[PDB]
Symmetry: C11
Subunit: 68 residues, 11 copies
């Protein structure tokens, strides 16, 4: 099952899980401060992930960067 790597490039970046299922709402928001790395799978509970704030992101499709 795949995962995504998120490195925060400033304080207060939010990595947000969206619920798997008929319903789509947030469920959890993990706060990363500058320099922290989160490596997060898709799961039974999470089928979409949003990143808000400035971060360096790696997936199986390559690098992408979110901007705050």
């Amino acid at each position: 099952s795949d995962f995504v790597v998120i490195k925060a490039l400033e304080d207060g970046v939010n990595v947000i899980g969206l619920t798997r299922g008929a319903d789509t709402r947030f469920h959890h928001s993990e706060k990363l401060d500058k320099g922290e790395v989160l490596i997060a799978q898709f799961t039974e509970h999470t089928s979409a992930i949003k990143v808000r704030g400035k971060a360096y992101i790696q997936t199986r499709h390559g690098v992408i960067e979110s901007e705050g």
Copy 2:
């Protein structure tokens, strides 16, 4: 399952999930502001995804860009 990465290049980009099944309709519209990134799977509820607004998109098939 496969997933798509979508980076909003302007405010109010919509990532819309179409229902899996005999019937096809929108079940969910996720609004991304400029710079946000959504990493979204195909799932039991979502078998097609439509992007409206300017965005940079990655899929297993490479890059493509939606335009406003």
Copy 3:
């Protein structure tokens, strides 16, 4: 399961799902306006897809372009 990416290059492009099974008919036609992207799986209900109108298409086999 495989998917196809379709970017509408003009207004009114139609992405048409054909039914899986002994019977073959159109069960849905999704209209895309210019610059909209649809990423669409093969599914239990859809075993062939037809694109009509000017579009840029990616699949596992590479890029192809439909014309209006």
Copy 4:
């Protein structure tokens, strides 16, 4: 399951599906006009696909052209 991409290069192209099973006959013919693209899987009901008319075809084994 694998699929074929067909792009019609002229009007009137036929993409014809052949029945899986002990017997072989055509169960559907989809007409493509010039510039339309069909992407079609092999399925429970279709184990062979015939293309008639001028089209650009892609499969996992690369490009081929019908005339």
Copy 5:
């Protein structure tokens, strides 16, 4: 299942399916006229395929040509 692409380079090409099982005989011949393409799988009923007449053939192991 694997499949073979046969493009007929003259009229009257025959693509012949041989029965799966302890018995081997031809169960079907699909006749192709010049420039027709047939994309044919191996199946519960067809474990060998013979081509007669001039054709350009593609398989997973590359291109081969048959000559009449």
Copy 6:
């Protein structure tokens, strides 16, 4: 889903011979190809080895090999 071999006869009377799967090994079928005909043949529940006699151009997943009559 099994592997397959492509055989192109380079002369008349080429034989593609199927050997039986199981405890018993014997020839169960011999397919005659004449010059320029092609046979694409799988390994199967009944065929676990394939013998080619006569001049033929053969492709497997391991590459090209040629049999000589």
Copy 7:
């Protein structure tokens, strides 16, 4: 199942496993000192991993480096 490699680049690095399921919280924090390597899988109990402190990290998607506060 996938795993991540983490090499601590200073003392006191924490590799934090987050619980799998509807609930998200830290269930374990593994402390690494300078020079030590942890190779950790995703598991039934850990579906996200956070790294705090300076570390050199490899995953299937390539190298990334965490930086400490």
Copy 8:
């Protein structure tokens, strides 16, 4: 399931199938004359194959030659 290609480079090349199971002995020898090719699988009955005589051999690990 894997297979070995054997091309006899002289008469009387012997391709020898060894029994799968707790016991090991030969259960079949298939002789090849010069220029004949044998493509043989590993099977429920054959878990090791010995080639005697001069032969050109392909396996998934490359080419090897037996010397007779």
Copy 9:
């Protein structure tokens, strides 16, 4: 199932297996003298492996080196 190779670059390298499950603690420590190699899998009982001491390490993601 994945494995790591550990080559000890000095005496007393410590390869530490952490228990798989809701709880985390070490369940085994295998010490290596200089020049010894351990090739160890992820298993039902081990889901994380820590290396202490100077070692040359190979995994599917490339070479890494622990320092004592």
Copy 10:
């Protein structure tokens, strides 16, 4: 569908020794090869390790290696 090794004897009297799978480990068979013969041998229900003694050229999925007598 297991892996297999290719052993080509470079001298007479090479031994390809199968070791028993399971809790116990012992030689269950030594196949003797003479110079120039090739054995292609799988891992199986009964054989989980293979020892080669004598001079031989060996291929496995990780490359070529040579045993010496």
Copy 11:
């Protein structure tokens, strides 16, 4: 299932199997003299392998060398 190749570069190399499961102990030590090759799988009974003595080692991650005593 994966395997490792070990070629002894001196007499008396040991290839040691560690038990799979909750208990970890050596259950077998295979002695190789110089020039002999052992190709050994991971198994229901062995989930880690230690090599002691000078040996040339191939795995799916490439070449490694153990250095003797």
